[PDB]
Amino acid sequence: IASHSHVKGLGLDESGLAKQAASGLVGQENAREACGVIVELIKSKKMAGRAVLLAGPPGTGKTALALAIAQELGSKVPFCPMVGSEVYSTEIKKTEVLMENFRRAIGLRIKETKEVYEGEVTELTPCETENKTISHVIIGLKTAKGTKQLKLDPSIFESLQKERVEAGDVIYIEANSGAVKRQGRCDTYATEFDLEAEEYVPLPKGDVHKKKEIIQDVTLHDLDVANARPQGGQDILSMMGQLMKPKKTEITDKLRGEINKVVNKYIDQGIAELVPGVLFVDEVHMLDIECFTYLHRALESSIAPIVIFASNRGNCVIRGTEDITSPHGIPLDLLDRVMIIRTMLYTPQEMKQIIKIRAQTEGINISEEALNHLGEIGTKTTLRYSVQLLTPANLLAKINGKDSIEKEHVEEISELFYDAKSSAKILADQQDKYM
Amino acid sequence: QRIASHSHVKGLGLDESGLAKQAASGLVGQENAREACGVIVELIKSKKMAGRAVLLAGPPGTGKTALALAIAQELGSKVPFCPMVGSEVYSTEIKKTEVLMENFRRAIGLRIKETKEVYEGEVTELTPCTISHVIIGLKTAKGTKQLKLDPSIFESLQKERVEAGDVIYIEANSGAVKRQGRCDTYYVPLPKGDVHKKKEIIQDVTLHDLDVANARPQGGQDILSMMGQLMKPKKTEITDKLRGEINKVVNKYIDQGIAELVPGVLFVDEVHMLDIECFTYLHRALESSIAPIVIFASNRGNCVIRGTEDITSPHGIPLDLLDRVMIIRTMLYTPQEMKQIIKIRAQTEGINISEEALNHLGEIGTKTTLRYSVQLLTPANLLAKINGKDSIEKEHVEEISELFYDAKSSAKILADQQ
Amino acid sequence: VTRIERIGAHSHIRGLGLDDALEPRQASQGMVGQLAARRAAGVVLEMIREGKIAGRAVLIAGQPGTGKTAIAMGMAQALGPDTPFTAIAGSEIFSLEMSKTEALTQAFRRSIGVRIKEETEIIEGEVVEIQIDRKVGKLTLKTTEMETIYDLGTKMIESLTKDKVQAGDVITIDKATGKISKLGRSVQCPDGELQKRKEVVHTVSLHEIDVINSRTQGFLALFSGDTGEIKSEVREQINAKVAEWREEGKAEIIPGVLFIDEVHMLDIESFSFLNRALESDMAPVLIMATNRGITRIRGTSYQSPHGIPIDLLDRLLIVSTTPYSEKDTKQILRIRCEEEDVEMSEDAYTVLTRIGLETSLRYAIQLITAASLVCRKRKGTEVQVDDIKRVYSLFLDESRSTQYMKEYQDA
Amino acid sequence: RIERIGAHSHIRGLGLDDALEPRQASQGMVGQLAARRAAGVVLEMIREGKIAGRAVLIAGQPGTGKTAIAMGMAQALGPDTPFTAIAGSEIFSLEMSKTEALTQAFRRSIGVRIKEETEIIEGEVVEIQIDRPSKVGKLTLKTTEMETIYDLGTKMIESLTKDKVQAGDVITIDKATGKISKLGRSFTRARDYDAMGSQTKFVQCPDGELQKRKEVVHTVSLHEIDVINSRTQGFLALFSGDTGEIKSEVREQINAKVAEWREEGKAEIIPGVLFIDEVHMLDIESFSFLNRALESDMAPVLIMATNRGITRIRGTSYQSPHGIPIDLLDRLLIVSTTPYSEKDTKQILRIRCEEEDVEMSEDAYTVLTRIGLETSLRYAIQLITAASLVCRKRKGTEVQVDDIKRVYSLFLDESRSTQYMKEYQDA
Amino acid sequence: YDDFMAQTTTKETLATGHFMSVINILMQLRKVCNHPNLFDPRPVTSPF
Ligand SMILES: Nc1ncnc2c1ncn2[C@@H]1O[C@H](COP(=O)(O)OP(=O)(O)O)[C@@H](O)[C@H]1O
Ligand SMILES: Nc1ncnc2c1ncn2[C@@H]1O[C@H](COP(=O)(O)OP(=O)(O)O)[C@@H](O)[C@H]1O
């Protein structure tokens, strides 16, 4: 696993100062100590709508710092990575995509109790009554601990019929959702025949009826989707499969209303806790002027999470406008609502240590001479190309039979694989021959 | 109730000889335009013509839209008046051609004499006589009634789950039994009237409702029930074999003497927004014999037609369509006409203003625009009522003119480029 | 501890700081300076509360970031609840399920409320005992002051048997429909009468009415399933029926507010539609903001002020905002610090005001929290000038990042 | 059986040695030693498969063997390893976004292989007795080594009757699920033909043990997994390409569960290759998404063919080499294919004419190499089939020079067509 | 098992020397040595 497997944190000291070389990162002291302020602001859970802009040339570690922020935040908060090209959806509104991304960028941890009925069923008698449909169903659930006759609903009886269960088998029942699974027939009946088309499972243990607590985690977008495209049960709502079945094109009336109301009701009663996360939007330069303008209200909203864009262009024409240009390909209207962070261009010395770290992370035993030659290769080419050259050199070394990468291996690899600038020069030399 | 931009327009202020009064029916000035509007509204009342379009052309702020609304008001409510903005044609659910055709066929009205009748009341007994009929007892505050209903209505009764004591409507014409609820004596009050409700419905309907009713089938008892869901999207009614049959049946009914045709009036606003394809389909469709009379409104002069980007035409309308369309010109107002319009707006909205205030307000209107002088009315009265003064003095309008800039001072400020 | 709504860029705005005579105070209710625009917004707010005039549009312009959206949020907070205030960005109308004109008329209809009042007898008490004879049954309800028996119908006894038949549940019985809702194991029991006649008031918008009366299971207003409402029968008939509810004692209309932020994104089509949507009696009042000067209207090469066509600009009023000075900037920063949990020294406030007047205002508002978190790292209590300088060095701004581009990147 | 020989049907794999040393004309490929060695290095890194999301760009002149090297890599990689070939213009769909189509293309070349040890029973049914009163019966299963009896249960009898298995039939029984599968009819399966029988295809009885434990393997791609998990319609992989899986838990959950499976040893990974031919068709949005899509740990390797040079990027007015922005070009390793010399063109023509079974004379080869050095190698190749037909028509044995000359005079290449376009020709 | 033995809480509870703490920790270790599904069973997952 490559291209992000070496970064596992910002490598900052207890005082928030950037360490020279640690946590898989080297250099970029200013950028890393600044992103420390961002991770602290995110962990504070106090602000909303704040935005950062990691700006720099290609391959200057902006995405590396973006992922290091997530690694520092941990897996408890939702980190939503997104590409600017994702807004161009063909099923939902372009702004709908962005608002749902913002919504899923926010987390919510909630502890919920749920009940379960389980045990080897002894008998299932449908209590009939005139309406002329089945009234109730008495099921005798046996367990290694005890046994209980329980009255369940005709819907649960119908679910059992769908499962095609019979008296004497083992079933798992849940009252909250209403789904019933057939774990198989009791192990005591496995001796009935020499072979059967039946799954066998022993007698369930413990109490027949048991309530258990689970601390789950879901994003606000999860509730939004659950309420927009409901599935539930007890009805024929399965028609969802043909009703519309695109991305539901959510609506503000319920996005900002009922969902916020119910989640605040859950939070203020000690059942749930809000867990704001991070929305990392890589490649923000291909967003349309409409998206840039909606970002104004998105960031000026009191619920938006901490956003992190990545700027790679110096000054070009804005997308969707075709006639106006601005720095970073972002309009000055949105650029005034962000905290820009430089990503310095790497020097030969820092690039050498980066190549060393990448080699030691990719399980490669590169010799010092080969490492130093990669220094020249990287000073003549891009850091990304010089670091990509690593693995082919390891394969060539394995082929040649040497246990380490030497000068000749990296030389052969570089001669076999060209770089962007070399290929551009070759094309310029062969101009009227490449079509 | 609440005042609007054209709520003060009651109609075309024309006398019996057709000449337009200087100030009447809420409209002032524009004598030639008002007289032409009356000349063309006489065509609507004649109803013997079709496929005619009249284009109100003039600068912004002129009374073209006001004259259209006056035509609509003078026509009244018996004949339909369908307004539509040129921007509304750019639909995403159905093509622009069919949007235009739907608006054209919806402008046309249709009055019909529906001689319905519905029995109403509380049920006292239900007995079905494999059923030849069903005897039902109905009760109201005029006596009891015994009714014999076709066995096909017994199905509707059973489906509505009506039983002794519930109040119901049963329409003799269709069998659409509707259970209003249970009687209050056991809920809805007992109906108090003649259980046998017989009256003539002279309610009017549009010619597009007939197409909307036949576009999708209404019923069930089969997989067809799945059709009630699925967004019910509006889709193109084919011209080949649907609207032709609608025309045929409407003609049959008119010949029999039940239906009565009342051609409506269409009103397109900002015609320059329509594409050239919409323009040419329009000049092709309005030549038909069943097309209504249309009133185009233009707001700009010589410009480029949308969709061409290489062809300029007067009023943003191609010559192919501009020919066969009568052009009524609306010109700018004078200071006196602006003062009259401002006074009319004031006395219609309910604000009493002094003479010195109205004079400077008309001055501001001649300086920036009539619509701006009009908009400056309400806030002046609001400040007056806040200060206690019930009327508007000159110290209120000339102070609200500093709070609310105009479209000219705004641009003068923006000239800073930042 | 932490709710959904948190501290934001406009959380400090609690409303318009005007007097009884619509006179803005120097700094009140979180709004600083901007006296002209604030008193010009108070007038439109007052005539909105009035509602006798329909189809008014008030545009606010000026330098970027001069409280343009702050004034709108203040107007919203002053209008308060029970009066729809629909704020939408200029892009929200560009949709795939609906046309731009359809989305704009949808917002116009959402910005209009209809008030309706009714009475309903509601029950609330603790269940004591239940009996069902397979069908009819009986129930025993209790409150802290009284108890009673009820002979329940088939549907009611079935709905009660659906739950735990034994005592413990505290349910509510809407006698109109009879929908049961157990509050919990008797949450405490209710006081007073068991059955009480309660007044129910609803402010339902015309768009909600349309969505409800447009289709079976009509309430698609939770996922925007209202694709191209049929104006032929739905909207016209709904308008007629609302006019009939009116002047009869059934309902009364409550005109709302529509705040179109960044209207320069709208196109000539949307503007032409507004030209007539602002003329209907059911037209709500709206406000609009713009940051661009004389620019091109999206759709053609016409260069018009505010990117809005002239035929529509003549249909609205314009209010210019003045640039903030040192006093206003410092007071705004102080109000932001009071809204947040941060506290700065006087020299720190002076340095932050200088930094927010050199480049721009939003930059200082953003650096506030960064300097707070940086001073919290060195184990301090107040944000100091050294911390503000550390932040000014760490985080860049628009004007200092556009000048650092002395190294060429992609384009 | 009948799958015609396409343009790339002659290459069976890269002609490389154990040390990745390309041979001159081995295994179908000819010349192009440097690019073939690079292809072999990347193919070895692929077969290793411990690094994800690596991109290679095979640039070169038109008709120099770029797609040929791609097909050779595909063949040398063979099955049991996803290889997805896609043209740059295939992602421009109407029902799904370009980024979604690219995510599909990537996740379609990532294989998940669940290895299971479900035991079964394989033998030749001798008798199937069953008595209906629940019905109960017995079965006699025979293999060449032993015979045994089994008491059949209710559902066992139900499934046996549904499958309609009879005596003499060789069947396999999944004891875990009870799934029956009849593999054929044994010699005993002879029905003593005295009625309307029309089947006599016999086969040897199963050998070995009666109740053996064999190993099954279920290999499905991450694309198929997320498609079947999207919605209850678990047939979109065949039903239709209607898609648009939200990037919510669905795909993230597929990834997280595949991670747990790899950790617990259920199914770890088998990376794949994505050959994007004519990548210059991709849009700026496509390139911008790929920039970060190559950074995912579940990203297979990709190889992009390039004919363009310094040309504008689609969707914009930026001049960039290969028609690709430097942003994405930086992640790639560029391999340049050189034009074939005289002896390389001649050997390619020889291999092609020997693959399509056409015998050419020594002078036919010379004239064809002349035509292919003056004009496109593709035109020279296409000339072979046309020249063989005139020979077959005149009842010849091997293509001569006169047939090739007749075909050259009869058909026109692009250059001679342009030089003949001397009239207006409805420009 | 590693994490249960690592945390200083259990180390101090053992160093205490009391009979209950020591025997309880030994029982917990034995149980973890018994397919710890008894010590930490796999919870069934279901949507919220
Ligand atoms: N500080 C660093 N330490 C080690 N490696 C680095 C560092 N910065 C960048 N790299 C290497 O450079 C490669 C590309 O950097 P990247 O983060 O993509 O820059 P950008 O985000 O500007 O494109 C990464 O694969 C990473 O291995
Ligand atoms: N002849 C008139 N008499 C009185 N008021 C008028 C007259 N013409 C226009 N107005 C008023 O001036 C305003 C112009 O509005 P409108 O008719 O929409 O202008 P346009 O001609 O640009 O459509 C309206 O509010 C209308 O009430």
Ligand SMILES: Nc1ncnc2c1ncn2[C@@H]1O[C@H](COP(=O)(O)OP(=O)(O)O)[C@@H](O)[C@H]1O
């Ligand atoms: N008069 C004021 N009083 C208080 N805060 C203000 C004032 N003016 C601006 N601000 C604050 O400064 C920032 C200015 O940005 P804003 O005016 O919203 O930019 P724009 O309106 O151009 O999008 C806002 O966050 C706002 O809260």
Ligand SMILES: Nc1ncnc2c1ncn2[C@@H]1O[C@H](COP(=O)(O)OP(=O)(O)O)[C@@H](O)[C@H]1O
């Ligand atoms: N080294 C080679 N050995 C054999 N055939 C080749 C070789 N290079 C090219 N060809 C043949 O040339 C024909 C066209 O060349 P191709 O491989 O498509 O190059 P390009 O992709 O640049 O057009 C193919 O049918 C291929 O069989």
